[PDB]
Amino acid sequence: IKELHVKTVKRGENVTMECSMSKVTNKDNLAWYRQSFGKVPQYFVRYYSSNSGYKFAEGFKDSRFSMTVNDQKFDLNIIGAREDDGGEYFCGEVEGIIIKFTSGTRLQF
Amino acid sequence: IKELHVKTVKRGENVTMECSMSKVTNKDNLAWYRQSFGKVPQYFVRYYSSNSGYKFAEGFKDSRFSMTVNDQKFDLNIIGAREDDGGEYFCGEVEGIIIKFTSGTRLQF
């Protein structure tokens, strides 16, 4: 089973967590999920038909996050990390009645 | 955010991890996901119309794992716990392009 990447950062550091695009069946069911410690995971940001390529969960109010979305990349960036960014982030694609996660990162301080 | 139930168990013990049928839109879309430490989560067992009511992921063979499924319950059972059962378990329903997790357990030793 795919091991998570572990990323150790300090307060105020810039970070990118990676997810490859090369093997996505339906770009449209691709998304990053986020799990804070001790909590259930939640849809965070999805691939999206737009100029940016992506759309955060409704009512996510934090412009530190962005993504790099192209033919090859679906990478999540943070400019200026803070303690509450810590947690696990899983990249996955919904396929039928199931989702398959193809990468993830445990971001820690 | 929903809190995971934190459960600490002893080797050999029995454990049930609860998930409700009460607000499910489509049962066919309901599944438990399993996450080993430092791994991506993986689909583990889904609702399935049958005498048992469920079907484990292809490749999984461990008869200590079962489910209690009825009109109210979609509960995951372990009979005779083992340390490699350690990890996080999430119950979610795919809803269109996105899975929504409704409950989970942090199973510890």
Side-chain angles (χ1 to χ4, degrees):
Chain A
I1 303 79
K2 232 295 211 302
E3 187 89 353
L4 299 176
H5 288 110
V6 186
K7 279 218 185 263
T8 312
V9 302
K10 309 174 158 86
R11 181 72 168 78
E13 175 162 358
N14 308 326
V15 48
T16 297
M17 307 175 272
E18 282 99 19
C19 177
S20 179
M21 195 74 101
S22 28
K23 40 298 160 78
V24 170
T25 318
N26 195 307
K27 253 88 169 296
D28 311 339
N29 301 22
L30 177 73
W32 273 98
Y33 286 69
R34 176 184 178 168
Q35 188 202 359
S36 298
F37 197 86
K39 302 304 189 310
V40 171
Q42 252 175 286
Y43 151 71
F44 185 49
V45 55
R46 62 196 169 94
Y47 177 98
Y48 183 75
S49 276
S50 71
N51 194 35
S52 73
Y54 62 90
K55 188 203 170 290
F56 289 93
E58 194 88 0
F60 193 54
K61 293 196 201 298
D62 202 320
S63 281
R64 287 170 319 113
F65 293 69
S66 57
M67 292 200 72
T68 298
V69 177
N70 59 46
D71 273 333
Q72 296 92 274
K73 294 180 184 205
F74 187 64
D75 308 340
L76 183 58
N77 317 300
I78 308 73
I79 289 162
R82 66 203 38 170
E83 289 189 57
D84 302 290
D85 291 336
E88 311 186 311
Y89 296 75
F90 313 119
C91 189
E93 194 191 330
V94 162
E95 238 264 8
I97 62 171
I98 253 73
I99 184 287
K100 295 214 257 208
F101 296 103
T102 54
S103 54
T105 292
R106 180 154 56 78
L107 186 75
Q108 77 179 342
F109 295 77
Chain B
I1 327 163
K2 273 284 312 263
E3 203 80 30
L4 301 180
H5 287 99
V6 177
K7 270 185 172 165
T8 308
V9 305
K10 289 148 270 148
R11 302 160 303 139
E13 183 172 333
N14 294 347
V15 43
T16 295
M17 294 175 269
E18 290 151 86
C19 186
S20 193
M21 243 12 144
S22 48
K23 302 287 176 293
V24 173
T25 308
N26 192 345
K27 283 161 164 183
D28 296 335
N29 294 332
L30 184 71
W32 280 92
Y33 286 69
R34 178 181 176 171
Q35 184 191 26
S36 292
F37 182 80
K39 309 295 188 310
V40 296
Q42 297 206 120
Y43 149 56
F44 186 49
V45 57
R46 53 188 178 103
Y47 179 94
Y48 189 75
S49 38
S50 69
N51 289 334
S52 73
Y54 57 94
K55 187 169 171 300
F56 277 93
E58 188 181 59
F60 181 69
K61 310 186 284 147
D62 195 341
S63 71
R64 294 174 313 108
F65 281 87
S66 72
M67 292 205 70
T68 295
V69 29
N70 56 39
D71 196 52
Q72 292 125 248
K73 292 273 152 171
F74 183 69
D75 292 357
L76 178 65
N77 311 310
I78 306 73
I79 306 292
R82 289 168 179 168
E83 304 184 59
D84 283 319
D85 305 332
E88 295 187 333
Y89 296 76
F90 318 120
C91 187
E93 187 178 346
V94 167
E95 282 155 71
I97 53 166
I98 264 295
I99 181 167
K100 293 163 62 148
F101 296 110
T102 59
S103 62
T105 303
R106 183 176 171 86
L107 183 63
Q108 325 161 330
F109 296 73

